[PDB]
Amino acid sequence: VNSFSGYLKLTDNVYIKNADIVEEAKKVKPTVVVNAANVYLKHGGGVAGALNKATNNAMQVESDDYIATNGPLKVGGSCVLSGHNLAKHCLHVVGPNVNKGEDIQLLKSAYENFNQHEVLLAPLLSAGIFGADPIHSLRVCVDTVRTNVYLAVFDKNLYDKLVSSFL
Ligand SMILES: O=C(O)COc1ccccc1
């Protein structure tokens, strides 16, 4: 049993809800919240800007020190950092940004990072401001992630479309 409430069950392991991932993290304090990161961990907007704002910029301060030490992530890669006031840990995952020309085949690699964690609160990777088709992102999630994932969809309209179109 876990703390997640009000999710629709899509599969054995994938669950979905219309929710503000920031508000959901604050309420649940999950072991892992996923950030929709970029390779530079520059948390300007979308999920990353909202998560970082909720940490009062502590996420960006930690991220800048991580990049200064390690250099940028790979598209499709991840790193584990603090979850600050939102979660135990933040898994920063870089999905391909279609609005930068990145290969959408990298979306499967991105979601494979989730399998290193038994339970996660996450957004749909490469969805929203990253420019991918969210219906596609949900299909790759379902077909890739084997661990238990709780998906927070920001757009209420999009949530209903994702549910109503799900195979
Ligand atoms: O709903 C999400 O989580 C990402 O996709 C969006 C679609 C429309 C507007 C904002 C986000």
From Swiss-Prot:
Cellular compartment(s): Host endoplasmic reticulum membrane
Catalysed conversion reaction: Thiol-dependent hydrolysis of ester, thioester, amide, peptide and isopeptide bonds formed by the C-terminal Gly of ubiquitin (a 76-residue protein attached to proteins as an intracellular targeting signal)
Activity regulation details: Inhibited in vitro by GRL-0617.
Record membrane topology: Multi-pass membrane protein
The Macro domain, residue ranges: 1-167
Primary role: Responsible for the cleavages located at the N-terminus of the replicase polyprotein. Participates together with nsp4 in the assembly of virally-induced cytoplasmic double-membrane vesicles necessary for viral replication. Antagonizes innate immune induction of type I interferon by blocking the phosphorylation, dimerization and subsequent nuclear translocation of host IRF3. Also prevents host NF-kappa-B signaling. In addition, PL-PRO possesses a deubiquitinating/deISGylating activity and processes both 'Lys-48'- and 'Lys-63'-linked polyubiquitin chains from cellular substrates.
Assembly and interaction partners: May form homohexamers. Interacts with N protein.
Record-given protein name: Papain-like protease nsp3
Interval of the full protein contained in this chain: 1025 to 1191 of 7096
